[PDB]
């Protein structure tokens, strides 16, 4: 088991007597057990890229190889934890050490031992019964929300020889024992998985059910789908916090995993201060979103491989909750700072630089990351579907999207939510640019929309047209003044203003904009576009006649309709039932039709 | 407790190559083990083991290897990494870049022997920055307020007076005052005149009881220049996290630190990365800058105001560029203001203190402060835009309001930004100066201030 | 049809052999079974990145952007297996596909492919952002083998000349658009404004085409003439007078 340190040069430790070790095997070096990976073998010698500072490591110090490559422990106790980039739990490190520092060479297990959670075995299992990877052998009630499914690791299979009865047990207690080919394996609630390896599935499915964020601008103009991959331009003035907090509080996602991939020291602590304090309604109770989330967190000075691996730990955790049948959402907050940590590994390994100094494989590291998203038929017996979505924030240098990490990310991700400083400076939250943003998933979501919201596809189309006409007409408005435009252009601009200020803007701090259900989003946009179609009909139908309609005539005859349209954002689903909101929208439609009947 | 065993001394120098002396037959050598060299003439010299491999230990000597030989040179291995003799009595004292005193005082009687490398502050233990540090400079305190525990570099360039700004911050800086504040000023690759300026301008002006001063000269060894930030931050960590002090660290030239990293990487025969700097430059800059912030259940907090000489006046260079990625916003010193004799030459337009929203609030300053800074920003920006209009149209073509933004711009540079090297302005006086400039406009023109705030403070 | 799939999550080094498997199957079907085959090579950029990865991981001598110095020959060992061969009725036709990094035509991936293949079909944001499917920009496009394929019995006899004049009119149309964006219509001639109008008529009728709309070359040439008729006969300076006299009034 033990090898010996042969030499040390900066963060790279050469070792000897390592003949039984493997490429990318995880190794503890030095008496303090500094973490590192085998990057090369040269006979009985191995070269270990140490993660932590190597100061003080000596020739002939022990080299204790862990048999497995870099891996994530998976099980109960994942929920609510703040893991670092290599799954050292920062909460356990703080509690056990009673120190403000992470001590060099932590040995703390990722899932806390001695916490004897309530376990229920799967009622269908028996001694002698067949079992396979992804089969649920029991459930652990760790939180009121997440009934944590315990399931056989994807490589393991055979005949069940023991299951624990109902009772209290931890991560180290043996829960299942099974025999295959005459060999017995003992399993606990803890499972261990290689962080760079995809967890296999029965079928990777197309993504077709919306991931609602509760924000009108996102859910209306550029929808995202459960299982989908999306990106955000993360910067100071972008307003990313409005998306991030809203996603965690309101999304139709059963588990959230957030990954700090080298955020700034203070910016990381702002996130780790907020997520405990964020609360969500469930079953008429209020509970901390920490009941349904886990944070991987790394400040910029965390070990290089802790930053680089943090993105892969997040998706390995997220795939594990996907495999339980949960619709997981992953947020990665700094894919640029991850690509910097990736670049630092290549610089230490002396790999040749590609575009802008990033490694040649950056495209493959990103692409194999985002391809781990999607909806799936899970492994094992219950046939259950599950999914991982991935939100990947990117930081274009000075707003330049041509940097290889940003360019590749926007080339890979099927959705982009183009946050823009010019909108946030005017407090236009969520501050998403409705020209620069896009979503490729429309063709796949149209199945769901045709079933549940058949009117919506016409509406989103007309919305984009109205917004595009505003941008194209604005040049003429500057060149000759708004007063010189045609009547069909003037009503188009007013509806574009109505959409911009009273539909796309959403003040999530207020009681009324706190969350916007999809029904409210359709009903608001339906009324705005119905008013546009009637206004457009009135002006175009009277063009070249003696008697003629213009925006001033409409506003003079029905100014209360424009006011009622603006009032729709204030209508609150908590105060007013969905039937009442639907009836009010039916009344606005009848009101505007009767109002236009006075002109035509 | 302590290493009870005796030290070994080796004559077995198998070679010398640039700054490196290669011992052989060494017993159990450590990476970064501190060693003491003795030359043939009996002169002592310092060094660290830059590489270990079997019986070989590649010492990087701190001083140049000149005078070392294979047969009379003796290397003494201390059995440990370099540790800082640290204590609270390091306040009121001046140290060279290795931590040896240069103030005619004794060695430090230490309260601890902290690992020079430090350790990562646990992100769950980290607390968000919560209150202002006065720098005493109006262009910082009234436009770019610095939260206690923020990192905020002063970007500068060759020839600009950023060392004078660094020194003035180090004299004038303190809490808001609506003895528990300490400064750790640490200066790398400093030319001997600027080192006399830092030493004298603090020792002559009473501030020393609340500052610890580290000097590393331009001709001091390049490896001592790497150690200087680590001593500063180790002392700042001791003062804050062992001793509750609020601490402000002034790292006066991160460019010469990065140039020292370039040399230490060349010393390991590593291939150069981006613009000739090491690939791992981001982690080394982060290992300096993230030794900062507040921590759960302690009053202590390390703030950093690095100063950073931008190569070629261009933020795209890896030194400023990587620094912008790690630190929470930046202050720019500007050659335009410098040539116009506006001292401090701090350009408040491109500058941004990212955490100023935390630093400013009711009970931390006057409640109006955030609104004042926003309106001053707008009026100075519009004043610059109107100066560009004046340049095209001449004065007779301007409106009365345009003339107010010009009067504002002239008076704002000549009263708000201009401070002088020894006038100290508390945040209250900076805000009264701010209001004295805002009062140039009619009450209704102050579009970024609430009418309640205007009714309480617009009258003079 | 036969498919070889290497997905973005699959191992990158398989991408070296992924197109070679397709071609090795195409060589069997075409040269041993006399079939005609269209071979599609999706994401030659992701292929070239697998070469860039192997190159960087082997310390191979770099060409531009850090691709291996041999990248041209590796791409040629893929691309050159297209062709007919003597005494066999078979034929391998290749349509490779490549996304250009940062849309740069001078990037090693498009550029080396550019030298090896018989001209390029190109697709452009200037068309796609206006909903002009298929967004095929004709000016950067060409076919090196088109000249030999165009002619009597293969096509209408005029086809070569119609092409030559469509390129000229569309090219002038782009140049007068680039002028107008600075100076407005007041510094353009009436003829320059006609080339600007030709560019609008051309993209809306010639390029714009439905995802299931099928057009023969003959209908395409009738459309081409109805566009070329925008100018007076004497302006069509790439076409011989006999071709004009037969077809211009139709």
């Amino acid at each position: 088991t033990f090898g010996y340190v042969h030499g040390v040069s900066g963060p790279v430790v050469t070792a000897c007597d390592m003949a039984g070790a493997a490429m990318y095997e995880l190794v503890r070096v030095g008496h303090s057990e500094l973490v590192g990976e085998i990057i090369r073998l040269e006979g009985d010698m191995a070269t270990i890229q140490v993660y932590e500072e190597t100061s003080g490591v000596s020739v002939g110090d022990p080299v204790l190889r862990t048999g497995k490559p870099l891996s994530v422990e998976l099980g109960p106790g994942i929920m609510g934890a703040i893991f670092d980039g290599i799954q050292r739990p920062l909460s356990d490190i703080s509690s056990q050490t009673q120190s403000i520092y992470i001590p060099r060479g932590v040995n703390v297990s990722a899932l806390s031992r001695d916490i004897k959670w309530e376990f229920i075995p799967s009622k269908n299992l028996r001694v002698g019964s067949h079992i396979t990877g992804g089969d649920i052998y029991g459930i652990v009630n760790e939180n009121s929300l997440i009934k944590h499914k315990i399931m056989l690791p994807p490589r393991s299979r055979g005949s069940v020889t023991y299951i624990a009865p109902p009772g209290n047990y931890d991560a180290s207690d043996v829960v299942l024992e099974l025999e295959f080919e005459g060999v017995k394996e003992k399993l606990s609630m803890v499972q261990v998985w290689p962080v760079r390896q995809v967890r296999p599935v029965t079928e990777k499915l197309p993504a077709n059910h919306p991931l609602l964020t509760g924000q009108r601008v996102l859910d209306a103009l550029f929808p995202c789908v459960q299982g989908g991959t999306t990106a955000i331009p993360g910067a100071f003035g972008c307003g990313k916090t409005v998306i991030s907090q809203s996603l965690s509080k309101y999304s139709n996602s059963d588990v959230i995993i957030y990954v700090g991939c080298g955020e700034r020291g203070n910016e990381m602590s702002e996130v780790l201060r907020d997520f405990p304090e964020l609360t969500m309604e469930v079953d008429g109770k209020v509970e901390s979103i920490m009941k349904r989330t886990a944070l991987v967190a790394n400040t910029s000075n965390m070990p290089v491989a802790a930053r680089e691996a943090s993105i892969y730990t997040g998706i390995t955790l997220s795939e594990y909750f996907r495999d339980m049948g949960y619709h997981v959402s992953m947020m990665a907050d700094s894919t640029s700072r991850w690509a910097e940590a990736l670049r630092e590994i290549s610089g230490r390994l002396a790999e040749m630089p590609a575009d802008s100094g990033y490694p040649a494989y950056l495209g493959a590291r990103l692409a194999s990351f985002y391809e781990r998203a999607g909806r799936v038929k899970c492994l094992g017996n219950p046939e259950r579907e599950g999914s991982v979505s991935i939100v990947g924030a990117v930081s274009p240098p000075g707003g330049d999207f041509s940097d290889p990490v940003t360019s590749a990310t926007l080339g890979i991700v099927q959705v982009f939510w183009g946050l823009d400083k010019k909108l946030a400076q005017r407090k236009h939250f969520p501050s998403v640019n409705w020209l620069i943003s896009y979503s490729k998933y429309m063709r796949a979501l149209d199945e769901y929309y045709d079933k549940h919201f058949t009117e919506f596809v016409p509406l989103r189309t007309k919305a984009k047209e109205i917004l595009q006409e505003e941008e194209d007409l604005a040049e003429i408005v500057q060149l000759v003044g708004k007063a010189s435009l045609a009547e069909t252009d003037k009503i188009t601009l007013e509806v574009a203003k109505l959409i911009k200020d009273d539909f796309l803007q959403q003040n999530g701090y207020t009681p009324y904009d706190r969350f916007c259900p999809f029904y409210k989003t359709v009903g608001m946009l339906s009324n705005m576009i119905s008013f546009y179609d009637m206004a457009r009909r009135a002006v175009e139908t009277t063009a070249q006649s003696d008697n003629k309609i213009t925006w001033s005539i409409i506003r003079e005859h029905m100014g209360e309709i424009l006011y009622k349209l603006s009032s729709m954002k204030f209508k609150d689903p908590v105060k007013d039932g969905e039937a009442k909101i639907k009836a009010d929208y039916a009344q606005l439609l009848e009101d505007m039709q009767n109002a236009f009947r006075s002109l035509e | 407790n302590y290493l009870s065993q005796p030290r070994l001394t080796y004559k077995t120098v198998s070679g010398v190559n640039g700054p490196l002396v290669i011992l052989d037959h060494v017993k159990f050598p450590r990476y970064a083990e501190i060693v003491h060299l003795t030359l043939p003439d009996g002169t002592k010299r310092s060094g660290q083991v830059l590489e270990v491999s079997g019986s070989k230990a590649v010492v990087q000597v701190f001083e140049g290897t000149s005078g070392i030989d294979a047969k009379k040179t003796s290397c003494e291995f201390t059995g440990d990494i370099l540790r800082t003799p640290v204590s609270e009595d390091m306040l009121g004292r001046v140290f060279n870049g290795s931590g040896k005193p240069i103030d005619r005082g004794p060695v430090v009687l230490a309260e601890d022997f902290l690992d020079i490398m430090g350790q990562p502050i646990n992100p769950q233990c980290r607390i968000y920055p919560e209150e202002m540090i006065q720098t005493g400079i109006s262009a910082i305190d009234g436009m770019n307020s610095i939260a206690r525990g923020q990192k905020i570099p002063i970007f500068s360039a060759a020839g600009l007076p950023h060392n004078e700004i660094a020194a003035q911050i180090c004299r004038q800086a303190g809490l808001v005052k609506k003895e528990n504040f300490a400064i750790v000023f640490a200066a790398m690759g400093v030319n001997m005149e600027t080192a006399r300026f830092f030493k004298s301008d603090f020792e002559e002006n009473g501030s020393m009881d609340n500052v610890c001063l580290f000097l590393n000269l331009a001709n001091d060894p390049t490896i001592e220049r790497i150690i200087t930030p680590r001593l500063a931050l180790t002392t700042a960590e001791f003062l804050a996290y062992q001793c509750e002090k609020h601490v402000l660290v002034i790292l006066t030239d991160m460019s010469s630190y990065a140039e020292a990293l370039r040399e230490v990487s060349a010393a390991r025969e590593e291939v150069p990365g981006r613009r000739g700097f090491p690939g791992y430059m981001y982690t080394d800059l982060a290992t300096i800058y993230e030794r900062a912030g507040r921590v759960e259940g302690r009053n202590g907090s390390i703030t950093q105001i690095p100063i950073l000489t931008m190569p070629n006046d261009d933020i795209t260079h890896p030194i400023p560029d990587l620094t912008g990625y790690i630190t929470e916003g930046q202050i720019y010193v500007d050659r335009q203001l410098h040539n116009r004799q506006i001292y401090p030459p701090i350009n408040v337009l491109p500058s941004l203190s990212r955490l100023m929203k935390s630093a400013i609030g009711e009970g931390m300053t006057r409640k109006d402060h955030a609104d004042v800074s926003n309106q001053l920003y707008a009026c100075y920006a519009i004043g610059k835009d109107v100066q560009a209009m004046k340049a095209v149209v001449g004065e007779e073509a301007l409106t009365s309001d345009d003339l107010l933004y010009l009067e504002f711009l002239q008076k704002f540079e000549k009263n708000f930004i201009t401070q002088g090297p020894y006038e100290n302005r508390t945040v209250y006086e900076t805000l009264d100066i701010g209001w004295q400039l805002l009062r140039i406009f009619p009450k209704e023109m102050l579009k970024r201030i609430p009418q309640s705030t205007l009714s309480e403070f617009y009258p003079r | 049809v036969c498919l070889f799939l290497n997905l973005a999550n699959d191992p990158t080094i398989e991408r070296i052999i992924t197109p070679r498997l397709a071609l090795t199957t195409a060589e069997f079907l075409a040269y041993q079974c006399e079939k005609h085959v269209l071979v599609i090579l999706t994401d030659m950029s992701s292929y070239a990145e697998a070469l860039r990865e192997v190159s960087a991981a082997r310390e191979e001598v770099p060409g531009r952007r850090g691709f291996p110095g041999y990248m041209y020959t590796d791409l040629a060992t893929i691309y050159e297996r297209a062709g007919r061969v003597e005494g066999r009725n078979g034929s391998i036709t290749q349509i490779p596909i490549l996304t250009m990094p940062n849309d740069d035509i001078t990037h090693p991936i498009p550029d080396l492919t550019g030298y090896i293949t018989e001209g390029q079909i190109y697709v452009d944001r200037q068309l796609h952002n206006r909903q002009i499917y298929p967004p095929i920009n004709v000016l950067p496009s060409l076919s090196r083998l088109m000249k030999s394929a165009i002619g009597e019995g293969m096509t209408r006899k005029d086809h070569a000349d119609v092409s030559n004049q469509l390129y000229a009119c569309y090219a002038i149309g782009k140049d007068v658009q680039a002028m107008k964006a600075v100076v407005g219509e007041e510094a353009l001639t009436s003829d320059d404004l006609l080339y600007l109008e030709f560019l609008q008529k051309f993209e809306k009728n010639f390029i714009t085409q439905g995802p299931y709309e099928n057009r023969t070359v003959y209908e395409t040439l009738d459309i081409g003439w109805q566009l070329l008729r925008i100018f007076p006969k004497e302006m069509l300076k790439r076409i011989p007078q006999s071709t004009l006299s037969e077809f211009y009034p139709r």
Binding site: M352, P353 | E269, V271, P272 | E59, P62
Partner: peptide, 23 residues
């Protein structure tokens, strides 16, 4: 970067050969 990686490789080979020649 490439030129310097090759130089460093040549030095590594010359170091190894110089050690092997002393055995």
């Amino acid at each position: 970067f490439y030129r310097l990686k090759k130089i460093q490789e040549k030095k590594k080979i010359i170091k190894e050969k110089s050690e092997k020649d002393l055995e």
